[PDB]
Write an enzyme that holds these catalytic residues in place. Structure first.
Site, PDB file in Angstrom:
ATOM      1  N   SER A  14     -17.755 -47.864  41.646  1.00 37.21           N
ATOM      2  CA  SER A  14     -17.191 -48.065  42.714  1.00 37.21           C
ATOM      3  C   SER A  14     -17.582 -48.461  43.544  1.00 37.21           C
ATOM      4  CB  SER A  14     -16.179 -46.530  43.246  1.00 37.21           C
ATOM      5  OG  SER A  14     -15.140 -46.266  44.357  1.00 37.21           O
ATOM      6  N   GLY A  15     -17.022 -49.209  44.566  1.00 38.68           N
ATOM      7  CA  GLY A  15     -17.268 -50.315  46.046  1.00 38.68           C
ATOM      8  C   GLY A  15     -18.892 -51.019  45.215  1.00 38.68           C
ATOM      9  N   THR A  35     -13.393 -55.439  42.146  1.00 38.01           N
ATOM     10  CA  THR A  35     -11.427 -56.280  42.410  1.00 38.01           C
ATOM     11  C   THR A  35     -12.167 -57.416  43.343  1.00 38.01           C
ATOM     12  OG1 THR A  35     -12.023 -55.533  44.311  1.00 38.01           O
ATOM     13  CG2 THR A  35     -10.501 -54.097  42.602  1.00 38.01           C
ATOM     14  N   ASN A  56     -16.169 -47.814  49.402  1.00 39.80           N
ATOM     15  CA  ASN A  56     -15.033 -48.513  49.708  1.00 39.80           C
ATOM     16  C   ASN A  56     -14.229 -48.721  50.007  1.00 39.80           C
ATOM     17  OD1 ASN A  56     -14.197 -51.403  49.821  1.00 39.80           O
ATOM     18  ND2 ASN A  56     -13.858 -51.913  47.356  1.00 39.80           N
ATOM     19  N   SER A  83     -10.260 -49.851  48.010  1.00 42.96           N
ATOM     20  CA  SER A  83     -10.658 -49.635  46.275  1.00 42.96           C
ATOM     21  C   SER A  83     -10.259 -49.788  45.775  1.00 42.96           C
ATOM     22  CB  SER A  83     -12.374 -48.502  45.838  1.00 42.96           C
ATOM     23  OG  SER A  83     -12.122 -48.494  45.372  1.00 42.96           O
ATOM     24  N   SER A  84      -9.638 -50.195  43.767  1.00 40.79           N
ATOM     25  CA  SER A  84      -8.556 -49.390  43.017  1.00 40.79           C
ATOM     26  C   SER A  84      -8.650 -48.893  42.950  1.00 40.79           C
ATOM     27  CB  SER A  84      -8.388 -51.016  42.446  1.00 40.79           C
ATOM     28  OG  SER A  84      -8.025 -52.234  42.821  1.00 40.79           O
ATOM     29  N   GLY A 138     -17.061 -48.993  35.440  1.00 41.55           N
ATOM     30  CA  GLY A 138     -17.897 -49.320  34.711  1.00 41.55           C
ATOM     31  C   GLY A 138     -18.546 -46.997  34.076  1.00 41.55           C
ATOM     32  N   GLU A 187     -20.581 -43.989  35.227  1.00 40.56           N
ATOM     33  CA  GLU A 187     -20.819 -43.494  35.281  1.00 40.56           C
ATOM     34  C   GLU A 187     -20.991 -42.250  34.936  1.00 40.56           C
ATOM     35  OE1 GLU A 187     -19.349 -44.796  39.253  1.00 40.56           O
ATOM     36  OE2 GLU A 187     -20.227 -43.130  40.517  1.00 40.56           O
TER      37      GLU A 187
END
Length: 971
Positions: free
Chosen positions: A177-178, A182, A228, A231-232, A445, A447
């Site tokens: 994330s971040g 996207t 982010n 963030s999606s 991904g 994590e």
């Protein structure tokens, strides 16, 4: 660097100038000293080895001094590989090498980096002038190896592969994330919209619609996270369909794993989805009146948690962009405000309060629960009755209805979001002919968190499936490489390595299979499922293991060994999240509502784990029918600061994605591959057996002669395959060889650092004529000057003086600094060298020469015995017909085995009075004395020139010689 001229202002952000690069290619660096060592905080740091002894290595961190074993020490990459564009070309593929290469480039504002097939992208956190139309034009038709690392290269080659190979394409974008997934996703899609061609509801062209699909879904799908601001929270796989030429035909979007926790809950620094805060911006007040909603977001519990406003985000401007996004996507006036009503109905749903009546739990009043029924088109009477008393009629308390309202809110929002993307797809479909397609994939991904629940298992299972899709593809390209190069190499498929972990999940009686089974039994709990897990796999399945004590918070129930590492999973709540229970009475009321939208997306109405299996299988099915292109996104730090990288953070991602995985699976075979030509130039100095003559045949003899494992390399055409730790040994021996050379050239230069006196003694005997010549003088090597005075002690010299010049100390020759390692003569001293000659005179006799040129104290002594045979008393020699000069002629020096030393063959032309033709063929051999380490030069020549004069004050027959010698031939 005239090639970077077409990139304009994007040049310094894509590739450094040849001026700036070459300054870094030649920087202070030494092997076996400047190495990598593991740190306690940064996990990897640069250090310089001080003293290694007892198996322990001591060095100094880039300030602290640490002592680690000699197994953790890792050699750095030479300055030649500084900020390289392809890390697959590195000589050292260990973790800190890959880490610091990314760290160096990112420090020079260079984002993109290649690693085999991967296109590693790092979050810039700043605006770069690299996305201009000039750059877009600069990447048109250019292969990956014909341009600097860029995201445009990936998407452009995908488009060209689609037309050239006539096969489908897929671009996979992963990361945490971040990391800017996207961001790269939109860059790739937008690129395609510009790349052309054009074939042939919704307003405008298809290019606009596909692009305008993003600001629509991000309103309901994205939120402000700690990492982010935009963030999606959902995976996405949009298939962009093209023609044969090809031209833009159609598109279709599918979402994956939308977290429903966001709508009813958010963290401390985070907030809910954008759509909520956009409506409350009062950019268009008719929505608030239609939704019966105030201005203050803190009046609604579902979105009041954490922060309510974002500094970078203007919810007023984004509201208009959101609204306009639907109009372009062909959304009717009814469909639009209906989504707003349902969105506003959820905001009222959370404001519902309930109390106990001593439990059946009766509502705490009509309040804002009436407004929620109006937007949803309900009865508000049958609603609160079914919400408290579901159905055969049961009863719930305050804690059971506070979950029912939340679960139903998640149900509405998800099925609306899913309805949204299906309505969008409808406008993205055209009757225009299709041929191939390009799949752009962006899923969070792999994590590892401190708390890994059921949601993490779904993601980590997807990435487990996606990683095999890479490992298999890599394995194919590897087999295609070794086979067509002429190397017989056989190994099992790389995707099989991850099969064991996957079988633990999807296969019958697996973790998912057991969960689906336990959901069928009402008489169950988290304890029964946990116990059923251990009873089936612990002992049988190797990837299933005992949970580790994290020595912190929280604690899990079992561990799972993935490709990225080992993850501890918490089982508490998995049974409930899987089947997802809903108040079917309220759901039944949803099916019969005035609002057509609410009743539409609640029709029919099977577990989440089984649903995810259905989506992933069709995703993998599509991907295996495509040409895969892998893009990896990396986030530098949590401080959102550009130019800086946190080593433990970046290393976490590198171990998670296939970057380090792709490296280790290629190490199984022969990773390091060097061309025959480049191999000769680099590793000839190790053993000059290649001679100054084929590269293919020479590489074999060079390696076969060395004390080396002959099974760690395979010969191909035209390339030489090396093992992992083999090439690291070659460079280790090479630098060790150079150290031996430079120290000997330094010692040899010491003896001839200045003016050195010379003594020459000759005892000759030509044609029976006895004579003795004694010479003296000095010589300077740095200048190449030589000054001597020869005097015959027996009287008149039987032979002409210019014939003895050759036999009268090439150790005083001037060698340039680049040829100073080719000075055999100075290397022999002080031990000296034996010089042997055999002079051939045309139509005359010959000379036999044996001289011992060695150091005797402070002066250099040349003692030579000469023996001449045959000749004639009326010839040029022993007749004194020759003049008094020696001119100038080069002496070609060749060194060869054995007994070290060199060999020389040069012609000499002495001048007669009338005529001027008298050839003298010289054959010379040299040999060092008393063994010892002696250098051995390559094929070069000595530029010699002698000046003969006379001293009018000397009564005896003599000769004053003054010559200049300078070496040349190589650079």
């Amino acid at each position: 660097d005239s090639e970077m001229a077409v990139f304009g202002a994007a040049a310094p952000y894509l590739r450094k100038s040849e001026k700036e690069r070459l300054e870094a290619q030649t920087r202070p660096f030494d092997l076996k000293k400047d190495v990598f060592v593991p740190d306690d905080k940064q996990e990897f740091v640069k250090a310089k080895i001080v003293s290694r002894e007892g198996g322990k290595v001591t060095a100094e961190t880039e300030g602290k001094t640490v002592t680690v074993k000699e197994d953790q020490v890792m050699q750095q990459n030479p300055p030649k590989f500084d900020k390289i564009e392809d890390m697959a070309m590195l000589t050292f593929l260990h973790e800190p090498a890959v880490l610091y290469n990314l760290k160096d480039r990112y420090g020079s504002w260079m984002i993109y980096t290649y690693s085999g097939l991967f296109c590693v992208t790092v979050n810039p956190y700043k605006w770069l002038p690299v996305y201009t139309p000039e750059v877009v034009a600069a990447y048109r038709g250019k292969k990956r190896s014909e341009a600097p690392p860029h995201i445009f290269s990936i998407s452009d080659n995908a488009y060209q592969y689609m037309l050239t190979d006539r096969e489908n394409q897929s671009i996979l974008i992963t990361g945490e994330s971040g990391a800017g997934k996207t961001v790269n996703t939109k860059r790739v899609i937008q690129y395609f919209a510009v790349i052309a061609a054009i074939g042939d509801p919704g307003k405008g062209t298809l290019e606009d619609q596909i692009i305008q699909a993003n600001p629509a879904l991000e309103a309901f799908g994205n939120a402000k996270t700690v990492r982010n601001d935009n963030s999606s929270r959902f995976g996405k796989f949009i298939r962009i369909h093209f023609g044969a030429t090809g031209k833009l035909a159609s598109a279709d979007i599918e979402t994956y794993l939308l977290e429903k926790s966001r709508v009813i809950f958010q963290l401390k620094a985070e907030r809910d989805y954008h759509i909520f805060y956009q409506i409350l911006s009062n950019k268009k007040p008719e929505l608030l009146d239609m939704l019966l909603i105030t201005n203050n977001p803190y009046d609604y519990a579902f979105i009041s948690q954490g922060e309510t406003t974002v500094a970078s985000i203007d919810d007023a401007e984004e509201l208009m962009a959101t609204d306009n996004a639907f109009d372009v996507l062909g959304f009717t006036s009814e469909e639009k405000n209906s989504m707003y009503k349902l969105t506003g109905a959820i905001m009222h749903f959370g404001n519902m309060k309930f109390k106990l009546k001593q439990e059946q739990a009766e509502p705490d009043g009509t309040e804002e629960a009436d407004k929620s029924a109006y937007l949803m088109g309900l009865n508000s009477a049958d609603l609160l009755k079914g919400l408290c008393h579901p159905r055969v009629t049961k009863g719930q308390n305050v804690q059971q209805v506070i979950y029912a309202t939340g679960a139903l809110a998640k149900a509405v929002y998800e099925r609306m979001f899913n309805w949204m993307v299906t309505r969008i797809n409808a406008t993205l479909e055209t009757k225009q002919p299709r041929q191939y397609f390009i799949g752009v994939l962006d899923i969070a991904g792999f994590e590892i968190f401190d708390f890994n629940s059921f949601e993490q298992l779904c993601i980590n299972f997807t990435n487990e499936k996606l990683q095999q899709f890479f490992n298999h593809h890599m394995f194919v390209l590897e087999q295609e490489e070794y086979k067509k190069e002429g190397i017989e190499w056989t190994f099992i498929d790389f995707g099989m390595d991850l099969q064991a972990c996957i079988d633990l999940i999807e296969k019958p009686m697996g973790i998912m299979s057991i969960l689906e089974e336990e959901c069928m039994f009402p008489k169950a709990t988290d304890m029964t499922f946990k116990a059923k897990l251990f009873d089936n796999h612990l002992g049988k399945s190797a990837n299933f293991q005992k949970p580790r004590n994290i020595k912190g918070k929280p604690e899990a129930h079992f561990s799972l060994i993935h490709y990225a590492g080992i993850v501890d999973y918490n089982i508490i709540g998995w049974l409930q999240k899987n089947k997802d229970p809903l108040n079917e009475t309220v759901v039944g009321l949803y099916q019969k509502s005035s609002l057509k939208l609410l009743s539409t997306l609640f029709a029919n109405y099977q577990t989440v784990s089984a649903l995810h299996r259905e989506n992933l299988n069709k995703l993998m099915t599509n991907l295996r029918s495509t040409h895969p292109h892998f893009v990896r996104c990396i986030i530098p730090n949590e401080t959102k600061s550009p130019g800086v990288m946190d080593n433990p953070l970046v290393m976490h991602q590198l171990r998670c994605n296939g970057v380090l995985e792709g490296i280790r699976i290629c190490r199984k075979g022969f990773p390091n591959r060097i061309l025959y030509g480049d191999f000769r130039q680099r590793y000839r100095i190790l053993n000059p057996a290649a001679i100054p003559i084929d590269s293919r045949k020479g590489a074999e003899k060079l390696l076969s002669s060395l004390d080396i494992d002959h099974n760690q390399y395979k010969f191909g055409h035209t390339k030489v395959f090396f093992k992992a730790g083999l090439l690291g040994l070659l460079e280790e021996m090479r630098d060790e060889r150079l150290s031996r050379i430079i120290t000997r050239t330094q010692a040899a230069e010491e003896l001839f650092t200045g003016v050195v006196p010379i003594l020459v003694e000759l005892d000759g005997d030509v044609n029976g004529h006895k004579f003795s010549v004694s010479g003296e003088g000095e010589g300077d090597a740095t200048y190449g000057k030589l000054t001597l005075k020869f005097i015959c002690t027996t009287g008149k010299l039987p032979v002409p003086w210019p014939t003895l010049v050759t036999t009268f100390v090439q150790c005083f020759s001037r060698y340039p600094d680049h040829m100073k390692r080719h000075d055999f003569f100075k290397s022999a001293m002080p031990e000296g060298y034996v010089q042997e000659r055999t002079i051939f005179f045309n139509d005359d006799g010959n000379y036999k020469t044996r001289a011992e040129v060695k150091f005797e104290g402070d002066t250099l002594v040349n003692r030579i015995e000469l023996k001449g045979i045959d000749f004639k008393e009326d010839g040029n020699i022993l007749g004194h017909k020759l003049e008094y000069n020696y001119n100038s002629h080069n002496v070609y020096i060749m060194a060869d085995k054995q007994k070290n030393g060199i060999k020389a063959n040069f012609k000499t032309r002495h001048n007669i009075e009338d005529g001027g033709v008298q050839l003298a063929d010289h054959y010379q051999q040299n040999t060092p004395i008393g063994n010892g380490p002696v250098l051995l030069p390559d094929n070069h020549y000595l530029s010699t020139q002698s000046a003969l004069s006379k001293d009018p004050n000397e009564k005896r027959d003599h000769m004053v010689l003054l010559e200049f010698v300078t070496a040349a031939g190589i650079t």
